[PDB]
């Protein structure tokens, strides 16, 4: 059962306190915008995956009745206690599953001794994460640099490609180009990892209208359908005291063994990949990324970024979105937003931020359990 996104949608993503308003007028207007986007009645929904961290379990609801108003329809909250998904990812598994054949990814979020000063710090800095991601992040980059020489002005590049795009993104927070110096001199968070290297906290919504494939042939929606030709999830991979490693600790082999997966089942490899959206949480997390992904063998990351082959007239753009670096890093809506530039950049519309003929786009994106979800992502009727 081949699975397609057929419309998406976002708000744009903001400073906490920064918009007025509450998480159900900021999930109407994302879910909103993909319903029209898909051309599609609201009546097509027949269920919606809603993705959120804060709040009790009623929000999702909340979001879902406000946006379409009241109905029936199963609501499913993606972030539960007993098995720790993604909305899309659940999305895709209700349609390929025969269980729907038209449903609605809703995402949101709206904020409401080295720990305790991690935890200061991620406070007064506004920062989009737990306070042992830094160190663990900071140690994995710094494994790195001592196994394959990889200096810190590489993770500072990272971080500095990915603002550069976001001069180009209206959704996201930061649309600023920094100098790299002004990369590197910006507050120190943990070790080589300054601000600009880190992922601030944004508030807003993503929205993503997934269908089967009788359900687009059926109301002629071939035009925007951006086929999921694989998608893989892997959750914690169980190893040794011997064979454990700080890389490993932040899913390094995770995300290799899900975009292997992918890349088998799409029965392409990474250097089809045209476009690329990834969850740089931290610069040190997109670095070690790119050798998990196989865009490069082990170790050489450092030369692939100072090729440039990360961004425009390189192999592979990296984050045309700008990455979670600027976008900042609503946690329920990250991944939608994600879906959002890389169906743009499929289907051309991606305006000054257009990769020319991008054919395959690879997604990479965190759940709330540390899952890593790897996306692959074709036009499906070219």
Not at 6 to 24: L, N
Request: glycine share 10%.
């Amino acid at each position: 059962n081949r699975v397609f996104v057929i419309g998406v949608g976002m708000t744009k993503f903001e400073k906490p306190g920064a918009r007025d308003i509450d998480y159900p007028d900021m999930a109407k207007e994302a879910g909103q915008r993909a319903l029209a986007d898909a051309g599609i009645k609201y009546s097509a929904i027949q269920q919606a995956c809603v993705g959120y961290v804060y709040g009790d379990s009623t929000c999702g609801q909340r979001a879902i009745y406000h946006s379409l108003g009241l109905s029936g329809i199963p609501i499913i909250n993606v972030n539960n206690n007993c098995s720790t998904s993604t909305a899309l990812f659940m999305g895709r598994q209700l349609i390929q599953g025969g269980l729907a054949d038209c449903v609605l990814a809703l995402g949101f979020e709206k904020m409401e001794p080295m720990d305790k000063h991690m935890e200061v710090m991620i406070n007064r800095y506004g920062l989009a994460a737990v306070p042992a991601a830094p160190q663990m992040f900071g140690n994995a980059g710094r494994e790195h640099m001592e196994k394959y020489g990889t200096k810190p002005e590489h993770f500072a590049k990272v971080a500095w490609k990915n603002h550069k795009h976001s001069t180009n993104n209206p959704y996201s927070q930061f649309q600023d180009e920094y100098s790299l110096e002004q990369v590197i001199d910006s507050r120190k968070v943990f070790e080589f990892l300054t601000l600009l290297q880190c992922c601030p906290t944004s508030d807003g919504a993503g929205a993503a209208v997934l269908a089967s494939e009788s359900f687009v042939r059926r109301n002629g929606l071939e035009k925007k359908a951006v086929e999921i030709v694989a998608q893989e999830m892997v959750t914690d991979l169980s190893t040794t005291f011997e064979e454990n490693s700080c890389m490993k600790m932040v899913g390094y082999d995770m995300t290799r063994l899900a975009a292997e997966r992918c890349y088998d089942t799409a029965g392409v490899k990474p250097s089809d990949v045209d476009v690329i959206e990834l969850h740089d949480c931290f610069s040190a997390n997109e670095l070690i990324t790119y050798e998990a992904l196989g865009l490069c063998p082990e170790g050489k990351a450092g030369e692939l970024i100072d090729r440039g082959d990360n961004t425009y007239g390189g192999k592979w753009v990296i984050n045309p979105s700008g990455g979670l670096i600027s976008k900042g890093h609503p946690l329920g809506a990250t991944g939608l937003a994600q879906c959002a530039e890389l169906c743009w950049q499929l289907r051309a519309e991606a305006g000054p931020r257009q990769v020319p003929g991008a054919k395959l786009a690879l997604q990479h994106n965190i759940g709330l359990g540390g899952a890593v979800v790897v996306t692959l992502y074709k036009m499906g009727f070219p």
